[PDB]
Amino acid sequence: INAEVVSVSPNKLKISVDDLEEFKLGVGSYLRVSDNQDVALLAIIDNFSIEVKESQKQKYMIEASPIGLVKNGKFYRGGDSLALPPKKVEPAKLDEIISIYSDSIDINDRFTFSSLSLNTKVSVPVNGNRFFNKHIAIVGSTGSGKSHTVAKILQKAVDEKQEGYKGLNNSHIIIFDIHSEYENAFPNSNVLNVDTLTLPYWLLNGDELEELFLDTEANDHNQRNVFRQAITLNKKIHFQGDPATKEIISFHSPYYFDINEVINYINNRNNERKNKDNEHIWSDEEGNFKFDNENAHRLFKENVTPDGSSAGALNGKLLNFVDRLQSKIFDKRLDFILGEGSKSVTFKETLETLISYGKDKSNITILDVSGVPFEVLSICVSLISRLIFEFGYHSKKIKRIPILIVYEEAHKYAPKSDLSKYRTSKEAIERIAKEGRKYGVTLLLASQRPSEISETIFSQCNTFISMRLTNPDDQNYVKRLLPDTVGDITNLLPSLKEGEALIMGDSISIPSIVKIEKCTIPPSSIDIKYLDEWRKEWVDSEFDKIIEQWS
Amino acid sequence: IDINDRFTFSSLSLNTKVSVPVNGNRFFNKHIAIVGSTGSGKSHTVAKILQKAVDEKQEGYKGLNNSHIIIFDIHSEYENAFPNSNVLNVDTLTLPYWLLNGDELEELFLDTEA
């Protein structure tokens, strides 16, 4: 009567308020509709309105959305028919808001890293087991502090430990940051950039190893056919294992090979010669032989001279091929993956760095891919993604350790586009998403452009923490891909504050607008302060020093 | 499909309760194509039809039926699949040269280029 619900729809609650000051508050506040005790329905507020009757004081309209009903402290989603035209409205108390989030998850499995935006005092704990074992997607536009949330979750991930022992916990954290953002956020972490990390070229699969050395645009099927052939025979001779395994070895099979002998194989095939017997005869100081699958290993050496007065069938068709590989094998930017240390490294040492079980075991491994060239960025981010998945695949085989692969700027690796330069990372990250949940290898898509991420990869993640999203194309992409929704809270995305997040999913009890805790040590990236350097005087001695290094 | 004609070797993936028979009279008499990349279990699915065709026997007798499947396997992948089968590798199989025609005999022995 004084303040009464006048429209009870199963999705929208429209109530009558005579005066707000006596009623007590903003958009998104929680409302309780119960004049009868022992049961209540909790409704979040959509919007206010004012209808003027022109004969009395104006009545403030409050449209609310029922998020669910509470019975004896237990929150159940849905809208019951117990609501009647004689109902009462008043703001929900702090203890009833607390009971929505506190009672749903047990004390041991609570994982709190934020608080409600409407009321700071109430803290929202997410179900930690359901949050981490399932894939997470943290999308929010630039300037919204998205990387602060990806940090503050991970600082709470390391700090979440068992009470039995204090120290380095069970987890493992791998971050693929391009902006070098999380160096300051985790100072005790193990950081690997191009100058120290040495990936092996032979661990690349068939899809990965083709695009590292070739391009699909300027290479025909006959041009690549020797390249699959040349590596395949080089794999078997360097294979020191049992002969009962070597027949399964192919170009897709990750076994060690020497790339420089493959270059000599391509270069020698560029200079192949036909004799009077019409056979690719070959000459070296050890003897005289013909080109065959048995005697192809002595072709791999450099000191092989062609003999014959007539050219071969595949002669001269590989000079463009070998020079393409010749440029990459001494490309100084590709020294981390085709260098001398890549031949000398082992698979044990390769996985000892990415997992970081070395001299300084740390929870968090940072793979700074800023120095990686952009044409091969989608390959190193694909090789490591497969390697941790293969580590996760074989960790349960030797046990018959969850690893979070944080993908900073995840749309750069896994885009909606189907271009061949992003082909390697998109299908490998799909294997992390679709399959790796049961092997313990779980991911974290952190990106400021969610709409560039492919839908298949993005939808698999079921817990959706979102900061301010204000690009209209980004908003329509995320709001279409939602597993759950509450009426007027997805429209609040461009109006979110700094550090204020929207987190939904089956881990959290109810979708809500939360405020992530402020980072004591924020993920600040050290950059070239352009206006600070440009304000200084003209540096002239430093130009001569650069060219000498270049030369 | 008639009762004597039904040849079930699989079940629906979206509903495993229902069995999916094929017209086995029209299944084998017209040519079959099994297609799938490595690691897809295609060798298991290829073998499964061949066990079921072998086990497809009339109840009036106990023993061998009239199954005749000849396998050109290049990866040596179904030697362990069928224990009652005969495997003929190179030291046991014997191929006469005189049964080759002149088109095969020219390629096996000589080269026209030299």
Side-chain angles (χ1 to χ4, degrees):
Chain A
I1 298 175
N2 202 359
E4 161 162 337
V5 195
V6 302
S7 160
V8 191
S9 195
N11 196 17
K12 158 174 301 193
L13 208 52
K14 171 199 153 220
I15 72 198
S16 270
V17 179
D18 289 350
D19 43 351
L20 281 163
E21 322 283 349
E22 201 172 349
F23 171 78
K24 297 145 191 182
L25 189 54
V27 157
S29 319
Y30 288 98
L31 270 185
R32 179 183 188 272
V33 288
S34 180
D35 54 348
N36 318 335
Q37 298 185 1
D38 304 358
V39 67
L41 175 77
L42 256 295
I44 219 160
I45 292 185
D46 313 306
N47 61 84
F48 316 144
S49 321
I50 281 187
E51 321 328 332
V52 176
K53 201 54 181 178
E54 216 190 1
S55 178
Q56 286 278 349
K57 196 184 176 181
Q58 59 249 37
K59 290 173 1 179
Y60 317 117
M61 263 312 89
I62 307 204
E63 261 90 342
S65 284
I67 81 176
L69 54 101
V70 283
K71 296 215 224 138
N72 62 271
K74 259 44 158 193
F75 172 76
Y76 310 108
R77 276 200 61 170
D80 218 0
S81 296
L82 196 46
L84 281 176
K87 278 300 143 163
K88 87 171 294 312
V89 280
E90 81 304 345
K93 45 205 75 54
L94 187 48
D95 50 278
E96 260 182 293
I97 293 154
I98 280 169
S99 323
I100 305 165
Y101 307 99
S102 278
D103 303 358
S104 175
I105 321 92
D106 305 19
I107 175 64
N108 159 266
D109 214 7
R110 274 187 196 121
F111 181 77
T112 174
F113 57 91
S114 59
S115 50
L116 259 181
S117 54
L118 254 287
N119 211 340
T120 279
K121 290 139 167 180
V122 54
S123 319
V124 46
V126 78
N127 197 351
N129 221 38
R130 300 195 70 180
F131 184 69
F132 281 85
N133 90 76
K134 295 172 181 301
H135 299 309
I136 315 104
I138 311 184
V139 298
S141 88
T142 179
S144 59
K146 162 195 51 78
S147 283
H148 288 64
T149 282
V150 188
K152 185 48 94 179
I153 287 168
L154 271 43
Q155 323 204 350
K156 287 286 191 135
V158 201
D159 214 4
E160 185 87 3
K161 294 128 58 162
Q162 279 181 339
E163 202 80 12
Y165 72 102
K166 288 190 172 182
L168 289 161
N169 74 325
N170 168 322
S171 59
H172 280 358
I173 280 287
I174 299 193
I175 315 178
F176 279 104
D177 44 358
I178 314 195
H179 298 291
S180 280
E181 223 162 8
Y182 302 103
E183 181 46 285
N184 302 60
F186 321 111
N188 264 6
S189 57
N190 164 205
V191 187
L192 297 164
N193 40 27
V194 176
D195 313 78
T196 88
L197 171 143
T198 312
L199 290 186
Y201 52 90
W202 30 278
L203 288 185
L204 278 72
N205 62 42
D207 267 286
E208 272 156 331
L209 184 50
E210 262 155 350
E211 336 313 333
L212 174 59
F213 280 113
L214 322 173
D215 59 328
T216 51
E217 310 194 0
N219 294 147
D220 213 309
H221 193 41
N222 165 269
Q223 267 48 249
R224 48 198 302 259
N225 227 359
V226 49
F227 182 59
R228 343 198 65 252
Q229 173 204 90
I231 275 157
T232 304
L233 330 178
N234 199 306
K235 261 158 187 311
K236 327 207 185 243
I237 39 162
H238 280 109
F239 180 59
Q240 318 265 41
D242 64 274
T245 282
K246 82 203 189 314
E247 72 305 349
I248 215 76
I249 299 191
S250 54
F251 168 64
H252 273 57
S253 68
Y255 303 101
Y256 166 70
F257 69 97
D258 193 12
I259 182 60
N260 320 107
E261 299 180 85
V262 173
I263 302 314
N264 302 341
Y265 189 99
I266 287 266
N267 196 316
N268 287 358
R269 201 141 197 85
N270 160 25
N271 305 336
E272 66 167 35
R273 295 230 77 151
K274 278 293 191 39
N275 68 333
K276 297 179 180 176
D277 213 356
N278 287 31
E279 157 70 35
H280 306 138
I281 212 55
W282 284 114
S283 166
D284 59 315
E285 63 102 11
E286 290 98 310
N288 198 349
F289 71 103
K290 79 168 140 37
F291 172 70
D292 81 22
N293 64 323
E294 162 46 69
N295 300 336
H297 30 60
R298 333 148 49 192
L299 180 50
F300 279 123
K301 305 307 287 219
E302 189 192 68
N303 274 50
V304 167
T305 36
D307 39 348
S309 56
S310 64
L314 318 178
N315 207 51
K317 288 132 68 158
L318 291 199
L319 172 43
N320 183 190
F321 212 74
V322 59
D323 269 345
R324 184 81 200 300
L325 303 123
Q326 274 303 10
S327 89
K328 276 168 175 67
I329 217 62
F330 330 103
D331 215 353
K332 279 301 167 271
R333 306 210 64 202
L334 292 169
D335 203 343
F336 71 103
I337 204 176
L338 314 181
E340 183 81 66
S342 77
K343 332 159 166 44
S344 284
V345 77
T346 63
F347 185 84
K348 182 251 281 188
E349 176 62 284
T350 301
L351 257 297
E352 208 87 283
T353 38
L354 304 169
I355 288 304
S356 87
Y357 273 143
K359 68 212 173 53
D360 265 40
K361 295 176 192 359
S362 192
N363 214 217
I364 296 190
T365 311
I366 289 168
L367 300 180
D368 163 65
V369 291
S370 75
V372 182
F374 82 104
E375 63 270 41
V376 306
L377 172 53
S378 177
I379 296 192
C380 321
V381 86
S382 189
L383 166 67
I384 303 161
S385 292
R386 177 163 48 79
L387 275 188
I388 308 307
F389 174 69
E390 152 173 353
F391 181 80
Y393 196 135
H394 300 139
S395 180
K396 73 136 197 192
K397 283 304 208 324
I398 74 171
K399 280 327 186 174
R400 201 158 165 175
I401 301 173
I403 318 110
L404 195 68
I405 313 313
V406 174
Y407 284 133
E408 180 70 34
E409 301 317 299
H411 61 283
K412 284 164 197 267
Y413 322 128
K416 246 148 101 164
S417 85
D418 174 21
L419 281 293
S420 156
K421 155 212 161 183
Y422 299 126
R423 186 252 308 281
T424 68
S425 65
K426 186 189 187 332
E427 81 195 280
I429 272 182
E430 263 218 270
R431 282 215 331 244
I432 310 304
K434 292 316 158 292
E435 162 56 69
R437 339 171 76 251
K438 50 220 70 171
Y439 294 134
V441 164
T442 77
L443 56 77
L444 196 141
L445 299 192
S447 90
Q448 57 199 344
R449 183 139 197 77
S451 150
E452 270 274 80
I453 320 183
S454 54
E455 297 175 320
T456 86
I457 303 207
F458 187 57
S459 91
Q460 170 30 279
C461 315
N462 44 37
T463 169
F464 276 80
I465 310 184
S466 308
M467 323 286 282
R468 181 190 325 107
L469 206 53
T470 173
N471 197 317
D473 170 317
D474 279 316
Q475 298 190 209
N476 297 341
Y477 179 84
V478 160
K479 80 163 44 64
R480 196 177 40 83
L481 264 289
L482 287 188
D484 200 24
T485 175
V486 164
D488 280 38
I489 80 148
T490 316
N491 324 127
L492 276 158
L493 278 189
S495 90
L496 291 191
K497 274 178 210 298
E498 307 272 57
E500 166 181 306
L502 159 84
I503 167 176
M504 321 176 268
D506 38 2
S507 192
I508 205 183
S509 319
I510 186 79
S512 35
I513 289 304
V514 308
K515 261 269 303 181
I516 313 294
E517 202 194 338
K518 147 185 180 284
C519 295
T520 299
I521 46 162
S524 56
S525 46
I526 165 69
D527 264 27
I528 306 107
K529 294 324 202 39
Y530 262 94
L531 201 63
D532 300 11
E533 316 275 359
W534 276 6
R535 265 199 261 271
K536 300 182 185 177
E537 216 180 358
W538 179 278
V539 306
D540 37 15
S541 42
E542 218 90 359
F543 185 84
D544 313 308
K545 286 191 52 56
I546 290 174
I547 303 305
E548 304 200 57
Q549 153 83 10
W550 202 345
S551 61
Chain B
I1 315 161
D2 287 6
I3 299 170
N4 278 290
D5 196 295
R6 286 193 200 114
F7 178 74
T8 166
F9 62 96
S10 53
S11 272
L12 251 186
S13 202
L14 280 302
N15 192 5
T16 65
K17 293 311 182 65
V18 63
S19 298
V20 51
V22 310
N23 200 292
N25 277 342
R26 302 172 148 280
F27 182 59
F28 294 114
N29 81 331
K30 300 172 174 304
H31 308 298
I32 317 184
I34 317 280
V35 152
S37 98
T38 176
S40 60
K42 188 201 55 66
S43 94
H44 297 249
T45 70
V46 159
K48 182 47 92 183
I49 300 140
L50 303 178
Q51 330 185 326
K52 286 295 305 310
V54 152
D55 303 358
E56 206 57 70
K57 299 148 52 152
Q58 183 46 244
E59 195 58 284
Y61 59 92
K62 294 187 177 183
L64 267 309
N65 67 326
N66 222 16
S67 306
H68 303 102
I69 292 109
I70 305 204
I71 299 208
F72 280 106
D73 50 339
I74 212 166
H75 296 318
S76 278
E77 230 193 344
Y78 326 84
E79 319 308 19
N80 40 3
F82 316 89
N84 210 359
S85 62
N86 273 18
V87 174
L88 295 163
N89 40 25
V90 293
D91 41 11
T92 56
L93 164 144
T94 300
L95 287 195
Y97 56 90
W98 40 276
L99 278 185
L100 305 150
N101 90 310
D103 300 51
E104 289 121 20
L105 212 53
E106 282 289 297
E107 266 201 71
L108 164 72
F109 265 32
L110 62 93
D111 48 332
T112 64
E113 317 177 352

